Amino acid sequence: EMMLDEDYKEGICLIDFSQIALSTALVNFPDKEKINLSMVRHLILNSIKFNVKKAKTLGYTKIVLCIDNAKSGYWRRDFAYYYKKNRGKAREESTWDWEGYFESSHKVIDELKAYMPYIVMDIDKYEANDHIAVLVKKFSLEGHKILIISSDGDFTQLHKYPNVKQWSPMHKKWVKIKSGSAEIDCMTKILKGDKKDNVASVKVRSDFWFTRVEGERTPSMKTSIVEAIANDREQAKVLLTESEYNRYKENLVLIDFDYIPDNIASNIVNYYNSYKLPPRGKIYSYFVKAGLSKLTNSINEF
């Protein structure tokens, strides 16, 4: 029986929220139109209502909204300047109002922190995946069951942790965390790169994807090397050259959640622990102030 067991260490839901909101915005807001504060506030609140309802029915009552905040870049890019620069380039050339979207979304995130009953993990230069990785490690060790709500995020690196599930709202399905190939899949990114984030192979210079000249290519790497190092990372010093090994060390920081620097992880945990949760009364007053007359009818749903 459910009643006879809603756990003393309560279930925690971490929502990969910026990606859900942005995906929805790219569908709902057309190109060549100014994206304003009210548009974004409505979208964010509607998305929260849908996804919190989901967590709650699945039995995970503590909600943490994990936010991508790249207003001033990325801590990883302070390490590897080229990290994710391909993403910025693409947004520059778009006719969608990225500037208005981001400006409005930052304002709304601040309203959530002031008024809504969720822990909003938002720190400039920190990624939603950083909050999820660090908090899953923390909460899983403390004995909490965890639900990650993320449409397309790959959280298979978290395969070692007990009682972690992932639900994809976009695809309406459960997503494997214990995939059976998590270490190999992680190592493939470390060794061969992850082009979508401008991470290059260990067989080329660190900033290859950002500085590539015409005709340049990535030398291939044998799958067997990837599998060998995935199985025993000490093999990196045996199967890689010195130059490749130095690149492997760089790529570990860019890819592997276990290589989030101590200060970054400590900052995330400290921000969580000190978080000032708004009194539940502030929801109604926020909805009135923002003129959300339809949502005032749905307070209990938040």
CSV table of C-alpha atoms in Angstrom, one decimal:
chain,number,residue,atom,x,y,z
A,1,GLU,CA,0.0,0.0,0.0
A,2,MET,CA,1.2,3.5,-0.9
A,3,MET,CA,-0.2,5.0,2.3
A,4,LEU,CA,1.8,2.5,4.4
A,5,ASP,CA,4.9,3.7,2.6
A,6,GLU,CA,5.6,7.2,1.5
A,7,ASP,CA,9.2,7.4,2.5
A,8,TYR,CA,10.7,9.2,5.5
A,9,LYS,CA,13.5,10.3,3.1
A,10,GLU,CA,11.2,11.9,0.6
A,11,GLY,CA,11.3,11.4,-3.1
A,12,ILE,CA,13.1,14.2,-4.9
A,13,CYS,CA,12.4,15.3,-8.5
A,14,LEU,CA,15.0,17.2,-10.4
A,15,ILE,CA,13.7,18.9,-13.5
A,16,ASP,CA,16.0,19.7,-16.4
A,17,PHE,CA,13.9,22.7,-16.8
A,18,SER,CA,15.6,25.2,-19.0
A,19,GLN,CA,15.7,22.7,-21.9
A,20,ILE,CA,12.0,21.9,-21.4
A,21,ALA,CA,11.1,25.6,-21.4
A,22,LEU,CA,13.3,26.4,-24.4
A,23,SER,CA,12.0,23.4,-26.4
A,24,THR,CA,8.4,24.5,-25.8
A,25,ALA,CA,9.3,28.1,-26.7
A,26,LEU,CA,10.8,27.1,-30.0
A,27,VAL,CA,7.5,25.5,-30.9
A,28,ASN,CA,5.2,28.1,-29.5
A,29,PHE,CA,6.8,31.4,-30.4
A,30,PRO,CA,7.3,32.1,-34.1
A,31,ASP,CA,10.4,33.5,-35.8
A,32,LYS,CA,10.7,37.3,-36.4
A,33,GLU,CA,8.5,38.2,-33.4
A,34,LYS,CA,9.6,40.0,-30.2
A,35,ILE,CA,9.5,37.5,-27.3
A,36,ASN,CA,8.4,39.5,-24.2
A,37,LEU,CA,8.3,39.0,-20.5
A,38,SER,CA,4.6,38.0,-20.3
A,39,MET,CA,4.9,35.4,-23.1
A,40,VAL,CA,7.8,33.8,-21.3
A,41,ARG,CA,6.2,33.9,-17.8
A,42,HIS,CA,3.1,32.2,-19.1
A,43,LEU,CA,5.1,29.5,-20.9
A,44,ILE,CA,7.3,28.8,-17.9
A,45,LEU,CA,4.4,28.7,-15.4
A,46,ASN,CA,2.4,26.4,-17.7
A,47,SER,CA,5.4,24.1,-18.2
A,48,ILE,CA,6.0,24.0,-14.4
A,49,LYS,CA,2.3,23.2,-13.7
A,50,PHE,CA,2.4,20.3,-16.2
A,51,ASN,CA,5.7,18.8,-15.0
A,52,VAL,CA,5.1,19.2,-11.2
A,53,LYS,CA,1.8,17.4,-11.5
A,54,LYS,CA,3.7,14.7,-13.2
A,55,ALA,CA,6.3,14.4,-10.4
A,56,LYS,CA,3.6,14.5,-7.7
A,57,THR,CA,1.5,11.7,-9.2
A,58,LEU,CA,4.7,9.5,-9.5
A,59,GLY,CA,5.2,10.1,-5.8
A,60,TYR,CA,8.2,12.6,-5.8
A,61,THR,CA,7.1,15.6,-3.8
A,62,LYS,CA,10.2,17.7,-3.3
A,63,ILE,CA,10.7,19.7,-6.6
A,64,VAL,CA,14.0,21.1,-7.7
A,65,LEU,CA,14.1,23.1,-10.9
A,66,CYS,CA,17.5,22.9,-12.5
A,67,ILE,CA,18.4,25.9,-14.7
A,68,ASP,CA,20.9,26.5,-17.5
A,69,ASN,CA,22.4,29.9,-16.9
A,70,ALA,CA,25.0,30.9,-19.5
A,71,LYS,CA,24.5,34.7,-19.1
A,72,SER,CA,28.3,35.0,-18.5
A,73,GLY,CA,29.3,31.7,-20.1
A,74,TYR,CA,30.3,28.4,-18.5
A,75,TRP,CA,32.8,27.4,-15.9
A,76,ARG,CA,33.9,24.8,-18.4
A,77,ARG,CA,34.6,27.4,-20.9
A,78,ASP,CA,36.8,29.2,-18.4
A,79,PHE,CA,38.8,26.0,-18.7
A,80,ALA,CA,38.3,25.3,-22.4
A,81,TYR,CA,37.4,28.5,-24.1
A,82,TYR,CA,35.9,26.8,-27.2
A,83,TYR,CA,33.3,24.8,-25.2
A,84,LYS,CA,29.8,25.3,-26.6
A,85,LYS,CA,30.9,28.2,-28.9
A,86,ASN,CA,29.2,26.5,-31.8
A,87,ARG,CA,25.9,27.0,-29.9
A,88,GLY,CA,26.3,30.7,-29.6
A,89,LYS,CA,27.3,31.0,-33.3
A,90,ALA,CA,24.1,29.2,-34.4
A,91,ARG,CA,21.9,31.4,-32.2
A,92,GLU,CA,23.5,34.6,-33.6
A,93,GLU,CA,22.4,33.7,-37.2
A,94,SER,CA,18.9,32.8,-36.2
A,95,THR,CA,15.8,35.1,-36.8
A,96,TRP,CA,14.2,33.9,-33.6
A,97,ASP,CA,14.3,36.4,-30.7
A,98,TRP,CA,16.9,34.6,-28.6
A,99,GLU,CA,17.9,37.9,-26.9
A,100,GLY,CA,14.3,38.6,-25.8
A,101,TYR,CA,13.8,34.9,-24.7
A,102,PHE,CA,16.9,34.9,-22.5
A,103,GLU,CA,16.3,38.4,-21.1
A,104,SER,CA,12.7,37.4,-20.2
A,105,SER,CA,13.6,34.0,-18.9
A,106,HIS,CA,16.2,35.4,-16.4
A,107,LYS,CA,13.5,37.8,-15.1
A,108,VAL,CA,11.0,34.9,-14.7
A,109,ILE,CA,13.6,32.7,-12.9
A,110,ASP,CA,14.1,35.5,-10.4
A,111,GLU,CA,10.3,35.6,-9.9
A,112,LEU,CA,10.3,31.8,-9.2
A,113,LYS,CA,13.0,32.2,-6.6
A,114,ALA,CA,11.1,35.0,-4.9
A,115,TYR,CA,7.6,33.5,-5.0
A,116,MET,CA,7.3,29.8,-6.0
A,117,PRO,CA,7.6,26.7,-3.8
A,118,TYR,CA,10.5,25.1,-5.7
A,119,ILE,CA,14.2,25.0,-5.1
A,120,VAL,CA,15.4,26.9,-8.2
A,121,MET,CA,19.1,25.9,-8.9
A,122,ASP,CA,20.2,28.9,-10.9
A,123,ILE,CA,23.9,30.1,-10.8
A,124,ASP,CA,25.5,32.1,-13.7
A,125,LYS,CA,28.0,29.9,-15.5
A,126,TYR,CA,26.5,26.7,-14.2
A,127,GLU,CA,24.6,24.1,-16.3
A,128,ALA,CA,21.4,22.2,-15.4
A,129,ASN,CA,23.4,19.0,-15.8
A,130,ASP,CA,25.9,20.2,-13.1
A,131,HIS,CA,23.1,20.7,-10.6
A,132,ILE,CA,21.6,17.3,-11.5
A,133,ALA,CA,24.8,15.4,-11.3
A,134,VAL,CA,25.9,16.9,-8.0
A,135,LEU,CA,22.5,16.7,-6.4
A,136,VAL,CA,21.8,13.1,-7.5
A,137,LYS,CA,25.1,12.1,-5.9
A,138,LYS,CA,24.2,14.0,-2.7
A,139,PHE,CA,20.6,12.8,-2.4
A,140,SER,CA,21.1,9.2,-3.5
A,141,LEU,CA,23.7,8.8,-0.7
A,142,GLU,CA,21.2,10.2,1.8
A,143,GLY,CA,18.7,7.5,0.8
A,144,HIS,CA,16.2,9.5,-1.3
A,145,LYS,CA,14.6,8.0,-4.4
A,146,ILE,CA,15.2,10.4,-7.3
A,147,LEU,CA,13.2,11.2,-10.5
A,148,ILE,CA,14.9,13.2,-13.2
A,149,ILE,CA,12.4,14.9,-15.6
A,150,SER,CA,14.5,15.5,-18.8
A,151,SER,CA,13.2,15.1,-22.3
A,152,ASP,CA,16.5,14.2,-24.0
A,153,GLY,CA,19.2,14.4,-21.4
A,154,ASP,CA,21.8,11.6,-21.1
A,155,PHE,CA,22.2,10.8,-17.5
A,156,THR,CA,23.6,7.3,-18.0
A,157,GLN,CA,26.8,8.4,-16.1
A,158,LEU,CA,24.5,8.2,-13.0
A,159,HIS,CA,24.0,4.5,-13.5
A,160,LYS,CA,25.9,3.6,-10.3
A,161,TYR,CA,23.4,5.4,-8.1
A,162,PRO,CA,20.5,3.5,-6.6
A,163,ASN,CA,16.9,4.5,-7.2
A,164,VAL,CA,17.3,7.0,-10.0
A,165,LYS,CA,14.7,7.1,-12.7
A,166,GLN,CA,14.2,9.5,-15.7
A,167,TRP,CA,11.0,10.5,-17.4
A,168,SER,CA,11.0,12.3,-20.8
A,169,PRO,CA,8.0,14.7,-21.2
A,170,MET,CA,8.7,15.3,-24.9
A,171,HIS,CA,8.7,11.6,-25.7
A,172,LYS,CA,6.3,10.5,-22.9
A,173,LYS,CA,8.5,7.5,-21.9
A,174,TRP,CA,10.9,6.3,-19.3
A,175,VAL,CA,14.6,6.8,-20.2
A,176,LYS,CA,17.3,4.3,-19.3
A,177,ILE,CA,19.8,5.4,-16.7
A,178,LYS,CA,21.3,1.9,-16.3
A,179,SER,CA,21.9,1.5,-20.0
A,180,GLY,CA,24.4,-1.4,-20.0
A,181,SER,CA,26.9,0.7,-22.0
A,182,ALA,CA,27.1,3.7,-19.8
A,183,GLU,CA,30.9,3.6,-19.2
A,184,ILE,CA,31.7,2.9,-22.9
A,185,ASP,CA,29.3,5.7,-24.0
A,186,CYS,CA,30.9,8.2,-21.6
A,187,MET,CA,34.4,7.2,-22.7
A,188,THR,CA,33.4,7.5,-26.4
A,189,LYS,CA,32.7,11.2,-25.7
A,190,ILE,CA,35.9,11.6,-23.7
A,191,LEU,CA,38.1,10.1,-26.4
A,192,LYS,CA,36.3,10.9,-29.7
A,193,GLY,CA,34.7,14.1,-28.6
A,194,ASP,CA,31.2,15.5,-28.5
A,195,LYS,CA,30.9,17.8,-31.5
A,196,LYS,CA,27.5,19.2,-30.4
A,197,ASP,CA,29.4,20.9,-27.5
A,198,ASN,CA,32.5,21.6,-29.5
A,199,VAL,CA,34.5,18.9,-27.6
A,200,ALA,CA,37.1,17.4,-29.9
A,201,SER,CA,38.8,14.0,-30.2
A,202,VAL,CA,42.0,13.4,-28.2
A,203,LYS,CA,43.7,13.0,-31.6
A,204,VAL,CA,43.3,16.6,-32.5
A,205,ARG,CA,44.0,20.0,-30.8
A,206,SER,CA,41.7,21.0,-28.0
A,207,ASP,CA,39.9,23.8,-30.0
A,208,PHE,CA,39.7,21.9,-33.3
A,209,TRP,CA,36.0,22.4,-33.8
A,210,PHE,CA,36.2,26.1,-33.2
A,211,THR,CA,39.4,26.7,-35.3
A,212,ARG,CA,39.1,24.0,-38.0
A,213,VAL,CA,40.4,25.0,-41.4
A,214,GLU,CA,39.1,23.6,-44.7
A,215,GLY,CA,40.2,20.1,-45.3
A,216,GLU,CA,41.2,19.3,-41.7
A,217,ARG,CA,40.1,15.9,-40.4
A,218,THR,CA,40.0,14.0,-37.2
A,219,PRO,CA,42.2,10.9,-37.2
A,220,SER,CA,40.1,7.8,-36.5
A,221,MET,CA,40.3,5.9,-33.2
A,222,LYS,CA,39.8,2.2,-32.8
A,223,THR,CA,36.7,1.2,-30.9
A,224,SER,CA,38.8,-1.3,-29.0
A,225,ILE,CA,40.8,1.5,-27.5
A,226,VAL,CA,37.6,3.1,-26.2
A,227,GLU,CA,36.4,-0.1,-24.8
A,228,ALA,CA,39.7,-0.9,-23.2
A,229,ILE,CA,40.0,2.4,-21.5
A,230,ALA,CA,36.3,2.4,-20.4
A,231,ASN,CA,36.9,-0.9,-18.7
A,232,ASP,CA,40.1,0.1,-17.1
A,233,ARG,CA,41.0,3.8,-17.2
A,234,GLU,CA,44.6,3.1,-16.1
A,235,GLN,CA,44.9,1.8,-19.7
A,236,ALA,CA,44.8,5.5,-20.9
A,237,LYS,CA,48.5,5.8,-20.0
A,238,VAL,CA,49.2,2.6,-22.0
A,239,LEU,CA,47.0,2.9,-25.2
A,240,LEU,CA,47.3,6.7,-25.7
A,241,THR,CA,50.3,8.7,-26.6
A,242,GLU,CA,51.5,11.5,-24.3
A,243,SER,CA,49.7,14.1,-26.3
A,244,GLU,CA,46.5,12.1,-26.5
A,245,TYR,CA,46.7,11.5,-22.8
A,246,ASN,CA,47.0,15.2,-22.0
A,247,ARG,CA,43.9,15.8,-24.2
A,248,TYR,CA,42.1,12.9,-22.4
A,249,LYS,CA,42.7,14.7,-19.1
A,250,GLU,CA,41.1,17.9,-20.5
A,251,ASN,CA,38.2,16.1,-22.0
A,252,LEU,CA,37.5,14.4,-18.6
A,253,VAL,CA,36.7,17.8,-17.1
A,254,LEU,CA,34.4,18.6,-20.0
A,255,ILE,CA,32.5,15.4,-20.1
A,256,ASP,CA,32.7,13.3,-16.8
A,257,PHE,CA,30.5,14.3,-14.0
A,258,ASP,CA,33.0,13.0,-11.5
A,259,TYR,CA,35.4,15.6,-12.7
A,260,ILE,CA,33.3,18.6,-11.7
A,261,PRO,CA,35.8,20.6,-9.7
A,262,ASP,CA,35.4,20.7,-5.9
A,263,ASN,CA,34.6,24.4,-5.8
A,264,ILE,CA,31.9,24.0,-8.4
A,265,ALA,CA,30.3,21.1,-6.6
A,266,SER,CA,30.6,22.8,-3.2
A,267,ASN,CA,29.0,25.9,-4.6
A,268,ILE,CA,26.0,23.9,-5.9
A,269,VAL,CA,25.6,22.0,-2.6
A,270,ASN,CA,26.0,25.2,-0.6
A,271,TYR,CA,23.4,27.0,-2.7
A,272,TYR,CA,21.0,24.1,-2.3
A,273,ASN,CA,21.5,24.0,1.5
A,274,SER,CA,21.1,27.7,2.0
A,275,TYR,CA,18.2,28.1,-0.4
A,276,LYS,CA,15.4,30.4,0.9
A,277,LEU,CA,12.2,28.7,0.1
A,278,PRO,CA,9.3,31.1,-0.3
A,279,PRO,CA,6.2,30.7,1.9
A,280,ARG,CA,3.3,29.1,0.0
A,281,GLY,CA,1.2,32.3,0.4
A,282,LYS,CA,3.5,34.0,-2.1
A,283,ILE,CA,2.1,32.0,-5.0
A,284,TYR,CA,-1.3,33.7,-4.9
A,285,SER,CA,0.1,37.1,-4.5
A,286,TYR,CA,2.6,36.5,-7.4
A,287,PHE,CA,-0.2,35.3,-9.6
A,288,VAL,CA,-2.3,38.5,-8.8
A,289,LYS,CA,0.7,40.8,-9.3
A,290,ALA,CA,1.6,39.3,-12.7
A,291,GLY,CA,-2.1,39.4,-13.8
A,292,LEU,CA,-2.4,35.6,-14.1
A,293,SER,CA,-6.1,35.6,-13.5
A,294,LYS,CA,-6.6,32.1,-15.0
A,295,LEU,CA,-3.8,30.5,-12.9
A,296,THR,CA,-5.2,31.8,-9.6
A,297,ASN,CA,-7.8,29.1,-10.1
A,298,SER,CA,-5.0,26.5,-10.2
A,299,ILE,CA,-2.9,27.4,-7.1
A,300,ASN,CA,-3.3,23.9,-5.7
A,301,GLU,CA,-1.8,22.5,-8.9
A,302,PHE,CA,1.5,24.2,-8.2
